[PDB]
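Hi team,

As requested, here is the filled-out complex form for the magnesium ion run. I kept the field names the same as last time so the parser does not choke. Let me know if anything looks off before we queue the next batch.

— J.
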Amino acid sequence: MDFAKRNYTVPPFKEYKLSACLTPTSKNPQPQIYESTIYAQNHVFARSKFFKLLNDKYKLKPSKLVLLGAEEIKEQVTGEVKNYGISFVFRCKKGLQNSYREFRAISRVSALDFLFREAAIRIRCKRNDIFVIDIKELEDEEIKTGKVAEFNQPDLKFPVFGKYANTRDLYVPVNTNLS
Amino acid sequence: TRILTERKISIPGECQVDLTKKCFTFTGPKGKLVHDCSKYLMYFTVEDSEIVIRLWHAKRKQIALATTVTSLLRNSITAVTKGFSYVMKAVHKHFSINFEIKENGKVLLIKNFMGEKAPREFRMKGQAVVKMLPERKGCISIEGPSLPDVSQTAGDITNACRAKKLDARLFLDGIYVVEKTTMV
Amino acid sequence: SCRKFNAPRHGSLAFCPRKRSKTIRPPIRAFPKDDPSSKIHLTGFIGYKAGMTHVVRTKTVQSLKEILDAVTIVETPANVIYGVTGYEQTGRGLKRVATVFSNHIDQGVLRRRYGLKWEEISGKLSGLSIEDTETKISEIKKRSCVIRVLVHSQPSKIPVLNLKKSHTAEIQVNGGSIEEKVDWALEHFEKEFNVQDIFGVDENLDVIGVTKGKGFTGVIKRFGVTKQPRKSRK
Amino acid sequence: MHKHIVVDASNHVAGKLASKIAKFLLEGHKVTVLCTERSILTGPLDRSILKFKSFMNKRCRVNPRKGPFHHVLPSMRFKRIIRGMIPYKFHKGKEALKNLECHEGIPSEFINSERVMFPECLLKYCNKPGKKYCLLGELLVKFGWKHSKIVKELTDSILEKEKELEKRLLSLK
Amino acid sequence: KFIELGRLVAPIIKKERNIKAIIIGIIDSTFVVLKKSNGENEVCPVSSLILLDEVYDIKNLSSEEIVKLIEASNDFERFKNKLREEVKKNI
RNA sequence: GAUAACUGGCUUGUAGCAGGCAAGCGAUCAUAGCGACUCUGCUUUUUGAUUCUUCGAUGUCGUCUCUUCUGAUCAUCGUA
RNA sequence: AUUGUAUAACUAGUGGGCACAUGAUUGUAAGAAUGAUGUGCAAAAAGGGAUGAACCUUAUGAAACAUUAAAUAUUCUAAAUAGUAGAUAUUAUACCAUAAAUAUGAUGAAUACAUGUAUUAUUGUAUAAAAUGGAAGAAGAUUACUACUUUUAUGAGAUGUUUCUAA
Ligand SMILES: [Mg+2]
Ligand SMILES: [Mg+2]
Ligand SMILES: [Mg+2]
Ligand SMILES: [Mg+2]
Ligand SMILES: [Mg+2]
Ligand SMILES: [Mg+2]
Ligand SMILES: [Mg+2]
Ligand SMILES: [Mg+2]
Ligand SMILES: [Mg+2]
Ligand SMILES: [Mg+2]
Ligand SMILES: [Mg+2]
Ligand SMILES: [Mg+2]
Ligand SMILES: [Mg+2]
Ligand SMILES: [Mg+2]
Ligand SMILES: [Mg+2]
Ligand SMILES: [Mg+2]
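And here is what came back:
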């Protein structure tokens, strides 16, 4: 975070692999184990999100559950930009909807945060309302959007319109060039 | 919203064009025009006998302006090479109309329109003139170097010489444009 | 509730507030436009009101008529020129440049500038040199756009008025050229001009004066308000 | 430590420039403004007429002499903007307003003196590019400014014309 | 000057520009990927940078080779240098 | 003023002024001009419902004189 | 969890109440009338909502120094015009000081079909009329408006550290 003003390479959301089961009893010792991956900020926030998902597909109350083990997954980044396509379900005022987007980033932790920036304008909802199904790396000839297909072509050159001042002072004399 | 947009305009050899920063100057045989292009947020480069206009990262409301400013500057090239000519012929019913020209084609005077006593005056715009035509005996031709001065003046006569307060589907008296050709 | 019937208001709001004027000879606020093609001529005069009679005249329309009209008479002796000013155009507006007077000034203007003991103050003062006036007329010719002259009247030729203070005024000069206007006005120092030079017959004028006085008045004579009924108290 | 500063007001936003000056006065400096008829007001020309037309409606109904005054000149209009930032009623604000002076165009005294600009208020570096705007003195012609033509001529001509050592080191040591 | 792979960049302010970086890849119209001198990869918008006039070729290089192309006076010594220009204006 | 007759305040049943949809009239043609059965509003200009302020006092109806303000414009001005 | 618990004797004031949150009965409706559970004002300080009996932080002797809460950081006014993007309409308030049925536009949004026709989500304008000269608190703002994240700082008899007074 030297040049930028916010951390865009390591966002607050991370990736956690979770697993849990039921507490043993007399009628049923050694019950079934489950596993998943949820994206959150700590393991405590990821514990609360995962236990609610287990309430809906099965009748397992979270008061009877026990957390087995949760570890974090990091990726050895090289630095090449890749293509990603995210499918998700978001909650709005009228009901639930499901959509699909395509992005371009360095890693799937970073490509998730580019979705939250776009969703702040087009959808206008809190970040806890989007449920992410899967993130996958897209190869060529699966790109369904012209925006990714325009930037994927090699040897790009385009200039920049200059509009930023190079001095953090109150006043300068007239004819000093802010280049 | 595409990345790069581009337009090209081919100039002739007799029309000379030179440009300073965001301002154009056209000099040819049949007159002179100057054009100000500083208001638009675009790039202007003069190549070998052609004008190139480029524009990066525009939206849909900005793409449509690239064609319009092209066709506006395209008209000013041919206008200095060839002047314009607009022929307007007056139609009448039971009354007659007289055309009077004063101070070398700057003032057009219209009399006896539907038998009214007060005559009408019309001034001409910048860089334009009016002449009579003795051959076709019922029309005049507005000839000028520049197009928007000519096309504005012909519209001024048509709107000001219509009849109001009466049924316009029956009376049918006015001045109407016949053809729009160049001077040569 | 609303007013029952409609009626216009009494009096004019263009003249509110009503106060007495500060002087007996008011200045002129506006002067007509100048054209550089026409000749050099003055624009004003100073007179004294005398009386009122009537004349008759004819008008044809064919047969003639007899119309009876009432006229008024203004007695005007000559006026003398004794100074030249100049104004320039700035960003704020008009600003004065200089003022050049003639050499010998009449004692009538000395009575106007210095009220009592005018013999004491005028004897002590002294005039400008040659070199001071040659700088001022040069700086008038280079910077000015509006040139006006100074004119004083001659009330001592009418002994009925019992007046020896003479009224002064400023009169614009509308003429051809700015440099030509100053050279015309320097020639006319201490020389008079009559009323016949400026106005001819059939030329509409403007008149500037002060009305008669009537003192502390009521409401009816001031504005035009309808009286009350007879039955009313107070 | 208190400085005297001459400011060129051109190519500046009108409201944002008056914000930074009002803090610069409340620390006890002296400042002068030149060319106040060339400040910028954002938005279309059509809204900016509708805003000023609502300001010309407020007048006292009982006695209109003791009412809100409407100044026309671009110097005296710019002073009304800076007065809204300053507590002009108490003794603290009465002193800071005695160090302020604005002018129309460029007068004769300041041809050789330098000028400064504010980089937090210039239009190229404040806002997004490509929106409509208008000048200040362009607006006040329609409300009755008598002289906008002579100031343009005199300032532009001003803005056109400006566009034995080794022995002494050995001896003194 | 343009945006391309290998363009040298610097911070925007005229002070505090001591460290440089090289663009690795292009994300969008306003986002770029850099390589620092330490070796971490940072994602940063265009509006924090200024461009320099030098282009390198990085089509085939490894990680460490791009890091290759990236790369006190006291009060008494400031008494002499003031003295030297002091006499040059006195003459 | 723990409690009415008058002014003020919250409300709009009643009063006044507009809207949406279109069965039909208009010689055939829903919308030149009108519009049934139903549905949604605004204003404080009638009349009600309540009793927050005044009972050691705020002078009632109508008329006469005079000033100013609102648009939901009767003429006068410009368009369709 | 509580070092006390239990029992007697004598005596005053009060018996016109109101408000917020949750849920009800009558009434077209009301700052209307009448009940149910909890907490307040009455009888309660300081800080914030521009201003306000009841809203939000919060327990109490006289002072000094550091840390926060509620709320804010262009200027009045102590405290970074510290970031991504959209809005053209003189846009912008938790209680709180109003807006509807209805008709149509726009996105490098999504799905179905043949560059365009259908729906869905987000969003703009019309509908929108009053009595002295006007209220986002004001000047003014289009990067001082709206939506979503991370840091820094300012800021209460609150909470910590030291001195002193009360059975
Ligand atoms: Mg008609
Ligand atoms: Mg009279
Ligand atoms: Mg009596
Ligand atoms: Mg009562
Ligand atoms: Mg009364
Ligand atoms: Mg009704
Ligand atoms: Mg009374
Ligand atoms: Mg009384
Ligand atoms: Mg109307
Ligand atoms: Mg009590
Ligand atoms: Mg309090
Ligand atoms: Mg408030
Ligand atoms: Mg401050
Ligand atoms: Mg602090
Ligand atoms: Mg305490
Ligand atoms: Mg404390």
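Two things worth flagging: Residues 13-16, 18-20, 22-23, 26, 42-44, 47-48, 50-51, 54, 57-62, 67-68, 80-87, 93, 120-121, 126-128, 131 of chain D lie near RNA strand G (CB under 10 Å from a C1'). Residues 32 and 66 of chain D are 30 Å apart (CA to CA).

Thanks,
J.
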